[PDB]
Each structure stands twice: as C-alpha cells, then as structure tokens.
Ligand SMILES: CC(C)C[C@H](N)C(=O)NS(=O)(=O)OC[C@H]1OC[C@@H](CCCn2cc(CNC(=O)c3ccccc3)nn2)[C@H](O)[C@@H]1O
Ligand SMILES: [Mg+2]
C-alpha cells in the first residue's frame with residue numbers, strides 16, 4: 001500500500017474489479033429481491049455537464065447502498081437521442097445528426113464509466129436506433145386503430161424565412177426567435193394522443209404515490225385541472241340576435257365552477273373566435289382589430305396567467321336565467337376557444353381576475369358571498385372574497401343563507417327545471433399533440449392513400465426506418481423533400497401512396513424507456529412478459545424538477561396504455577421520486593466596446609477577480625445555473641482530470657442536500673479531496689502500526705470506557721448513515737456523520753490489543769458506509785483491511801449492545 005492517495009492509480013483498477021465480477025450485470029434472478037433504481041437518461045449532447053454528474057452520482061449512491069444490503073439492483077443507462085440539438089449541429093458543422101449523435105454517445109459513455117457508476121451497460125439503449133423506436137411505432141398503430149391516437153387539424157406557428165414550425169416559446173412579439181420574421185398561423189393535420197380519456201385515472205392515481213413530493217403531485221393535479229362546475233345558458237336578448245346562427249342565436253352557453261355566485265354576474269366574456277364576437281365585430285373595426293390581435297398571439301401556457309387581461313364591449317346583451325339581469329357581452333383575451341364553450345361569466349366580487357378586469361373597465365361588482373362579519377369593499381380585493389367553504393350567500397334572493405354545496409345543488413335544480421343548465425365536469429388537460437415538423441425524430445407509421453385514407457403501417461413492416469444519410473439544410477425539414485423516403489405503395493391496396501413525413505414528439509421515447517430496460521434486446525414486443533413481471537415498477541426515480549409535469553405525466557400515461565394492452569401489470573411507473581436541485585456558479589464578464597457584456601468562463605479567471613490571460617480586471621457577477629448563456633459552465637471532465645472521480649462524487653454529495661441547489665466551490669472541491677487523503681492516511685497509518693486484525697465483535701464487557709464510547713459512536717453512525725441513505729435521502733449529513741466518527745477515532749488511543757480490534761471494526765465500517773459515495777477509494781482501502789469481497793461482507797450491521805449504556 002502506497003503512502004499517498006493517487007486516484008489515477010486506483011480508480012481504473014477498481015472499475016476493472018467490478019466489471020470482472022459483473023456485480024452490476026443483473027438478470028431476472030428470483031433468488032434475490034429486485035431493486036430498480038433509475039436516473040433520467042441524458043440527451044447525448046456531446047459531453048457530460050455538472051448536472052449529469054450530480055444526478056447519476058445520486059442514483060449510484062442509492063444503487064450501491066441497496067447492492068450492499070443484498071438487493072438484485074438494476075441501474076440502467078441509455079441515450080435520449082432524438083431531438084433538435086443534433087439537427088442544429090448538423091446545420092452548423094455539415095454532419096449527419098446520426099453520426100453526430102453516435103460519436104457523442106461513445107464519448108459520454110466513456111465519461112460515465114470513468115465516474116465508476118455501477119451501471120448495467122448490457123441493458124444500454126439508444127432511442128434513435130430502429131430496434132428501439134420500432135416499438136413506439138407499434139404502440140402508435142395499435143392505439144390509432146382503437147381511436148386513442150387520432151388525426152385532426154391544428155394551428156401551428158409557421159416561420160416563412162426559416163421554413164419551419166416553431167413552438168410558442170420560439171415566438172417573440174409575433175416573430176421567429178432566429179429569423180426575426182413575422183410568424184404565420186397555419187392549420188395543418190396533426191396526430192394526437194387522446195390523453196383526456198385517461199384524465200380521471202391520471203388524477204386519482206396520484207393519491208397512490210405516497211413516496212412522491214407533494215409539490216410534484218400538486219403540479220400534476222393543477223395541470224390536469226379537473227373541476228366540477230355548471231353549464232349555464234344565458235338567453236340572447238332580442239336586440240342582439242343580428243348575424244347569429246343556430247343555438248348561438250338562442251342562448252350564450254358558459255361554464256362556471258362558482259354557480260353559487262350566479263346572482264352576482266355583472267357581465268359575460270367570450271373568446272375572439274366566438275360567434276357572438278364575430279357577429280358584433282362584423283360592423284365595428286375596433287372589435288375586428290381586437291379579434292385579430294388575439295388570434296395573432298403566441299403566448300405559452302407557462303405565461304398565460306401573467307398575460308395582461310384585456311377586453312372590448314360588444315354592444316350585445318344576454319339575460320341571466322336566475323334573476324333576469326341584462327348583461328353585456330365582452331370579447332376578452334383570456335377566454336380561450338376550445339376550452340369549454342369558449343365563453344365565461346364574470347363575478348368580480350368573488351373572482352380576483354374578474355375583480356381586476358372589472359376594476360380596469362369600471363364594471364359593476366355585486367357581493368353575493370359573506371364570510372363571518374368581514375367587511376366588503378368593492379374597491380379592494382381581499383382573500384376571503386374567494387372563500388368557497390366558510391361563505392354564505394347574500395343578495396341572491398331565494399338562495400340567501402346557503403353554503404357552497406347547498407347553493408350549488410339549488411342552482412342546478414333551478415337551471416335544470418327551466419332547461420337553462422345542468423352540472424358538468426371539465427378538465428384543463430388538452431390532448432397530447434405529437435406531430436413534429438422535424439427530421440431527427442421517430443417516423444410516424446402512417447401511409448396516406450387517396451383510396452384507403454390514412455393507413456397504419458402493418459406490424460410485419462415495422463419499423464419505418466428513418467434514413468440516417470441526411471444533413472438538414474434549413475429550408476424545411478428534409479423528409480418532406482425526399483421522394484425516396486415518402487413515395488411508397490399502400491399496405492392496404494398496393495396503390496401509389498405517400499408516407500407521413502412528420503416525426504414524433506421526442507417525449508414519446510422517454511415515456512416508456514424504463515420498461516425497455518427490462519428486456520432491451522426483446523424483439524417480439526415492447527417488453528418481455530417474463531422481465532416485466534420480475535422488475536415490476538421502478539423503485540427509485542431521480543431527475544430534475546423541470547420534468548415534474550410533462551415527462552412524468554406522459555410516462556404515467558404510457559404505463560396505463562401499456563397496461564391496458566397487456567404488456568405490464570403496474571398502474572404507476574415510479575414508486576419513489578427524488579428531484580435533484582440545480583448546479584449554479586458565479587458569472588464573470590468584461591464590458592464591450594458596444595455597451596454590452598462579454599461573458600467569461602470561470603476556468604479562465606483567477607481570483608487575486610482577474611482574467612488569467614492578461615492579468616486585467618474582470619467583473620464578478622451574479623450566481624446562476626450553469627449554462628452557455630452567460631458562459632459559466634464548469635466542465636466535469638476537467639474536475640475528473642485534476643482530482644479524480646471520487647473527489648467529484650464526494651463534493652457533489654457533501655456540498656448540499658440533493659434537493660437544494662449546489663453552488664460550485666473550488667475550496668469545496670479541495671476540501672473533498674483533502675478528506676479522501678485523510679481517509680487514505682488513516683488506514684495507512686493504522687496498518688503501519690501492526691497490520692490488520694480481526695475486527696471486534698461480541699460481548700463488549702471488559703472494554704475500556706474510551707473504547708466503549710468509540711463503539712457507541714461507531715454503531716450510532718451506522719444507524720444514522722443507514723437512515724440517511726434509505727429514509728431521508730440526505731447524503732451530506734451521512735458524510736458528516738462518518739467524519740464525526742473519524743474525529744472521535746483520532747482522539748481515541750487504539751494502541752492496545754482490544755484497541756486494535758475496535759480500530760479494525762471502525763475502519764471496516766467506515767469504508768463500507770462511504771463505499772456508495774466514493775467506491776474507488778473504499779474498495780481499495782477495504783482490500784488492505786480485509787480479504788473478503790466487500791459486497792459480500794454487506795452493509796454494516798448495528799450492534800444494539802454497543803448503544804446500551806451502563
Ligand atoms: C427523462 C427524460 C425526459 C430526460 C431528458 N433526456 C433530459 O433531461 N436529459 S438531460 O441530459 O438534459 O439531463 C439528464 C438528467 O441529468 C441532468 C438533469 C439536469 C437538471 C438541470 N440542471 C443542469 C445543470 C447544470 N448545467 C451545466 O452544468 C451546463 C449546462 C449547459 C452547458 C454547460 C454546463 N444544473 N441543473 C436532468 O434534469 C436529468 O435528470
Ligand atoms: Mg402502496
């Protein structure tokens with residue numbers, strides 16, 4: 001055993017030791033209890049960043065902890081390979097997205113291996129390979145025939161300069177983010193998953209996820225947005241029926257979740273596309289311009305509430321069916337066509353958005369709810385205005401004195417008896433649009449035949465292979481310009497037909513990959529029945545909070561779809577969920593010659609803050625998440641090259657709890673490396689005193705008080721670390737606990753015969769308690785202390801007798 005700790009001399013040897021023993025290569029072995037620990041697989045972007053290292057170190061800590069406790073642990077890794085980054089690098093570097101992807105995969109796989117993650121690489125998947133996406137094409141065809149996947153026209157944002165479709169996030173002031181050209185709204189046929197058919201299942205099954213953060217489940221409930229409200233029909237006044245057709249000439253239908261406040265409606269609002277808006281705008285040009293501006297908007301869902309609410313009056317009126325009030329119809333920008341009836345009522349006294357809307361236009365506010373003896377001021381909104389449980393009705397005629405649920409049922413009775421309304425349940429959730437006008441994605445297995453219609457590709461002909469010999473040029477997605485791809489024969493009639501050229505939303509690959517890991521080479525289905533029944537569901541899932549809504553919902557949706565097809569037998573894909581925090585770092589910049597800022601990487605800066613190149617000052621700016629935006633990313637490969645994998649892993653687990661943001665710190669890195677030197681020196685100095693002995697065990701009567709105190713600290717540390725790994729999942733406090741054990745060990749004279757035995761017991765436990773976090777150095781130090789295989793010695797047991805004081 002060498003005196004000094006040298007990671008480059010031990011880390012490759014420890015990795016070869018694990019790989020030779022195949023401790024991470026697992027099968028469906030019924031002799032050991034399974035454990036499925038999964039970290040969200042990465043985009044093969046080029047190289048790992050610090051977020052990857054934190055996520056996969058966390059997953060490796062939990063996996064190795066369960067491994068030491070005797071579980072048959074599967075920790076798989078793969079590549080979410082489809083998407084736009086490969087197309088953009090293709091347009092910048094004149095390479096094929098496939099070639100760019102596969103080279104990134106090879107390099108990033110080397111980095112992951114150098115970090116010592118206990119990963120079953122024999123289960124690796126690449127989602128851009130036909131052997132993977134053939135099965136999501138298969139599920140697509142099966143659901144398309146059942147109507148769960150359907151085709152209908154939708155509206156997209158067309159950029160005519162870049163010749164591409166853009167998301168709402170890519171539109172700024174009505175113009176493309178890169179081209180700067182005005183975007184055009186176009187109706188094109190697209191495919192949709194009928195996810196609203198599973199809305200009630202996806203909402204209620206969240207209650208089963210006892211080991212998910214309540215934050216994530218709340219976000220999913222709000223996204224699904226179930227409401228039990230009332231359909232209310234307002235009869236159109238006789239003086240307001242010009243230009244109206246059908247039922248729109250008879251009544252205005254609306255949906256409200258507050259029918260107990262129907263006596264407090266002071267106006268109604270309709271969407272820009274509503275027929276009442278169209279009829280009233282046929283004359284007035286200001287209404288036409290307001291309708292045009294609403295349609296030209298491209299506001300994303302995450303900013304819908306922040307959008308300034310505006311409206312225009314129409315001069316048309318409707319009648320409240322409960323009190324006969326004649327209310328004016330307004331066109332408003334917050335009423336969205338396709339959501340319910342595309343029309344709402346407004347009770348400014350008990351809905352804060354209606355309050356601010358009415359306060360802006362001086363529209364009437366009428367109180368209909370009272371809570372205690374609270375004072376109502378029509379000029380200032382108070383939180384009790386919207387109270388839905390402790391409120392009682394006022395100014396509502398025959399409904400006065402009722403609470404929410406009683407007034408709800410009475411209003412429903414009044415409306416139904418006169419045919420003016422009925423109860424109704426609504427969901428904010430929209431159907432899942434999966435069509436993408438992009439090349440680097442999974443082809444949609446549909447053939448268009450003018451005789452047979454939109455025909456799904458048969459199962460024998462799957463997959464529809466995406467050609468990899470493609471370099472996108474920019475002037476449109478190349479698939480729609482490659483007759484060698486889309487020209488084909490109809491699988492139903494053999495006649496001339498055309499393949500679909502749109503590709504799938506890349507969220508689809510990530511919606512079922514956790515199942516594919518169970519049998520990644522199975523060629524007769526998405527997942528083999530024998531492996532699905534063994535591994536069941538993912539026991540532990542680790543990823544970033546940015547996937548709390550869409551990805552998780554999609555994955556839960558796919559699981560229930562695959563269960564209904566009979567491929568799996570679990571209702572939920574992920575039992576436990578851990579959301580890791582961001583990795584942030586200081587920023588540095590120099591002022592431009594044009595009044596701007598040039599952002600400088602931290603690796604090119606030395607703190608006396610001075611640029612390393614010319615020794616000239618640099619401005620220290622705010623700390624934020626690492627990104628290429630302000631050029632503040634710290635390359636983990638340089639951290640590995642300079643300190644080793646164990647130092648990188650230890651710093652990430654010690655700097656902050658997994659949920660809390662991790663602040664990059666040079667001294668924090670150095671403190672981690674110096675602790676590994678201390679651990680190395682501790683075992684070296686111990687073995688230099690007389691070599692290893694048998695660790696203390698059994699009756700501790702007769703041990704000195706100092707050695708009894710060390711054993712108490714030892715097994716209290718084991719219980720604390722076990723609770724930190726297994727229950728709390730706070731790895732920073734576990735490292736501190738082992739440090740406190742080593743501190744007391746340093747203060748204890750362990751030179752006697754019984755002292756050596758206790759010292760052996762301390763060090764054998766300490767290297768095993770830290771093995772999940774820093775396995776390279778712990779595997780090396782364990783082999784110097786004991787000749788048994790560390791993974792066969794197992795997780796340290798707590799000696800209860802060591803915790804009983806006299
Ligand atoms: C399941 C599917 C849907 C996952 C999907 N393929 C994915 O998110 N793949 S992914 O490759 O993007 O990420 C894979 C997993 O590990 C990383 C987590 C990142 C969380 C956000 N973050 C990032 C940072 C730090 N950035 C840097 O240092 C940096 C950045 C840019 C340039 C230079 C440096 N700090 N926080 C992800 O959420 C996920 O769990
Ligand atoms: Mg349960």
Ligand SMILES: [Zn+2]
Nearest residue numbers: 449452490493
């Ligand atoms: Zn045909």
